[PDB]
Amino acid sequence: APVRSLNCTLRDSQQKSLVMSGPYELKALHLQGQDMEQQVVFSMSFVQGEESNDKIPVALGLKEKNLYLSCVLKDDKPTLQLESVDPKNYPKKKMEKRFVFNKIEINNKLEFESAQFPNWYISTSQAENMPVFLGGTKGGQDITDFTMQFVS
Ligand SMILES: NC(=O)c1cnc(C(F)(F)F)nc1
């Protein structure tokens, strides 16, 4: 049947919100009050892929935009990008692998691993107003843990 999707926001474990930073760029910053309207709302689709109790394959599209987070090699490195798609054809249950993240629940937090690039994760910096990026460890100074908020 159709693909099932939920509207949501994400915040990193330091409670930074995600906003735009150009036509295809996301940054993370501390946000509260009026400025919270600036945060990106995702449509999280539950897609085809290997699945277990705590590891759920999803795609992350921007709400009512034909833009998806994707993982590709750029200048020979696994990188995160926002990629446009044909709005007639998306979302779909069989999303291409570059669009698929494994949403992993550990200790009441979420990690989003690239399905395409094992052990590469959606990451934020500790500094304010820096890009969201794909980081090659769920270790170290960069942040790989998030919480989800459900949106109407
Ligand atoms: N400048 C970056 O490292 C960067 C990568 N990826 C993104 C995305 F896809 F979240 F929007 N925004 C910025």
Side-chain angles (χ1 to χ4, degrees), residues 1-33 35-36 38-54 56-92 94-104 106-140 142-152:
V3 56
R4 287 202 289 166
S5 309
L6 287 175
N7 296 337
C8 62
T9 59
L10 299 176
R11 288 204 287 274
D12 77 14
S13 56
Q14 253 322 302
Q15 298 258 61
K16 300 200 304 296
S17 290
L18 307 188
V19 300
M20 300 319 297
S21 191
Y24 292 81
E25 286 210 286
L26 283 183
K27 67 177 168 174
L29 84 169
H30 285 102
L31 267 189
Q32 191 176 91
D35 279 355
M36 280 244 287
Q38 306 161 18
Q39 75 190 316
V40 299
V41 182
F42 296 95
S43 180
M44 179 179 297
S45 292
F46 292 90
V47 299
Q48 190 169 294
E50 197 39 59
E51 180 163 351
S52 69
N53 282 346
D54 308 313
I56 303 296
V58 301
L60 295 167
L62 282 47
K63 179 198 159 60
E64 291 175 295
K65 296 187 165 307
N66 54 329
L67 287 171
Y68 286 80
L69 291 174
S70 72
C71 305
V72 297
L73 292 182
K74 182 175 201 160
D75 184 42
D76 311 315
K77 195 200 159 71
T79 72
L80 190 63
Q81 65 177 14
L82 274 170
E83 175 173 348
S84 65
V85 298
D86 184 334
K88 171 181 175 163
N89 293 334
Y90 287 85
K92 60 190 189 178
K94 300 165 182 218
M95 292 292 283
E96 295 82 356
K97 188 144 291 158
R98 62 194 181 270
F99 296 117
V100 181
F101 297 86
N102 299 315
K103 181 178 64 75
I104 300 159
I106 301 154
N107 290 132
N108 312 104
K109 292 296 296 177
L110 301 170
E111 300 165 324
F112 293 89
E113 185 205 28
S114 174
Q116 179 81 287
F117 301 100
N119 299 310
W120 287 75
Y121 294 87
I122 300 180
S123 302
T124 62
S125 292
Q126 281 292 349
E128 195 83 341
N129 237 248
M130 301 293 294
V132 181
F133 65 96
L134 207 66
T137 193
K138 68 168 163 169
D142 300 323
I143 299 163
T144 57
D145 292 318
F146 297 83
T147 67
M148 193 178 16
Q149 307 70 49
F150 292 85
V151 170
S152 318

